[PDB]
Design a protein around this ligand. Structure first.
Ligand SMILES: Nc1ncnc2c(CN3C[C@H](CSc4ccc(Cl)cc4)[C@@H](O)C3)c[nH]c12
Length: 416
């Protein structure tokens, strides 16, 4: 056991005084560890906060060069670095109010003036969040204690999140107040909800935990090293026939295979040669299953979501189109008859420059898949191939501006 510089429990619970006392001592202690550029980034954060956090949520979806050249990138890196100066030595339970719309719950739990949360609403919220992972991203201020009477309580939903060991946490002073900054960047699972009473009103307290995953975001180099560490020896694990079919697929055979699968060819017009290729590629993907929870990115064309390039509903620059898209797909399963190519990185690429839908997939540990880019003779980069017939549960949809074009981030989970 590491003896921490300033002792604390994992959860301060309702003890505001003890949490605030510890938070102030920590803010002072970490300030002493911060570089000049990091302290300066923290000063800029106190004066912007909203724009700096918004930037941190979608910065990784642009081209690698657009990221570097962005005017907010240096401040993002300095503030990110400041938070990583305090990776916690043991878990910490945190608290924050959240909008139920964050979990795609679009009904009202209760109004600000209503005191009660009906069992009807409570159970409807439970059904929306149960058995789902939700990606949380960007800079966020959180509390170290359960809010009470004399605390701001802006929504009927209170998150009680266990932050694991080594999560960066930045306690900092802001004039006469103290707060804690985190950068998020994980999947959460809401294990349990309970109706609690704070000052004569019902609130839903959501017991959430971080479900760890690898998510390289724009760091394609780190993603590539991971893929190569786990799949450099993959082609040698295959039979010569499995490898020849994987290579044939990668070398442009994907068109005949994926069109055959999409058109339901194995049922309406069976092709034994193509069926054998599908069987071998599928078996190859089951040889070395994804070893850990892994987040991948796919730049999707409109056809994957029943649209075309000229469809008016594909104009996400109109709010009614984002609303119609979210209503149709959030909480739904998306099935792919074809093999699905994805990247370990979220960056935009010339090949997919204009695609407006970013499918952000969490692959559970043990799923079929392979890092195809670890193959020697293959040119294709950062590629994880997923098995044909994969179904993806869409948890949440978000929008972002890519210049003048609104694009969507579809947060989905590969379902077994
Ligand atoms: N719809 C899709 N979305 C995202 N990624 C993929 C991929 C995976 N790779 C992206 C990549 C696009 S072109 C390219 C080449 C070199 C470099 Cl250094 C960066 C980009 C291909 O090599 C395969 C296939 N289909 C995808």
């Amino acid at each position: 056991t590491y003896k921490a510089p300033i002792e604390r429990p994992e959860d301060f619970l309702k003890d505001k005084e003890k949490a605030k006392e510890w938070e102030r001592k920590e803010a002072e202690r970490i300030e002493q560890k911060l570089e000049r550029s990091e302290k300066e980034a923290l000063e800029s954060y106190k004066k912007d906060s909203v724009e700096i956090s918004k930037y941190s949520q979608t910065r990784n979806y642009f081209y690698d060069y657009q990221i570097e050249a962005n005017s907010r990138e240096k401040e993002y890196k300095e503030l990110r670095n400041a938070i990583s100066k305090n990776k916690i030595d043991k878990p910490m339970y945190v608290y924050y109010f959240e909008s139920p719309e964050k979990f795609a719950f679009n009904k009202v739990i209760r109004t600000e003036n209503q005191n009660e949360i009906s069992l009807e609403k409570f159970n409807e919220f439970k059904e929306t969040i149960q058995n789902k992972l939700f990606k949380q991203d960007g800079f966020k201020d959180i509390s170290l204690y359960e809010p009470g009477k004399g605390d701001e309580k802006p929504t009927p939903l209170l998150m009680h999140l266990k932050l694991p060991r080594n999560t960066g946490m930045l306690p900092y002073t802001n004039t006469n107040n103290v707060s804690t900054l985190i950068e998020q960047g994980y999947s959460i699972k809401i294990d349990k909800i309970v109706r609690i009473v704070i000052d004569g009103k019902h609130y839903i307290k959501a017991e959430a935990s971080v479900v760890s995953s690898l998510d390289f975001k724009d760091d394609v180099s780190k993603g590539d090293s991971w893929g190569k560490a786990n799949y450099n020896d993959w082609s040698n694990k295959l039979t010569p026939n499995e490898l020849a079919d994987v290579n044939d697929y990668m070398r442009g055979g994907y068109t005949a295979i994926n069109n055959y699968l999409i058109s339901n060819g194995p049922v309406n017009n069976p092709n034994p040669e193509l069926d054998s290729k599908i069987t071998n590629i599928e078996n190859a993907l089951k040889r070395e299953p994804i070893p850990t929870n892994l987040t991948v990115y796919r730049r999707s064309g409109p056809q994957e979501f029943g649209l075309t390039l000229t469809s008016p509903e594909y104009d996400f620059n109109k709010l009614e189109n984002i609303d119609a898209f979210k209503s149709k797909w959030e909480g739904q399963a998306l099935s792919y008859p074809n093999f699905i190519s994805t990247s370990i990185g979220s960056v935009n690429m010339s090949a997919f420059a204009k695609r407006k839908i970013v499918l952000r997939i969490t692959i559970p540990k043990g799923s079929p898949g392979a890092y195809l880019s670890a193959i020697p003779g293959y040119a294709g980069e950062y590629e994880v191939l997923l098995n044909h017939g994969s179904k993806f549960k869409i948890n949440k949809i978000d929008s972002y501006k890519d210049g003048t074009i609104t694009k969507l981030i579809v947060d989905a989970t590969l379902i077994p």
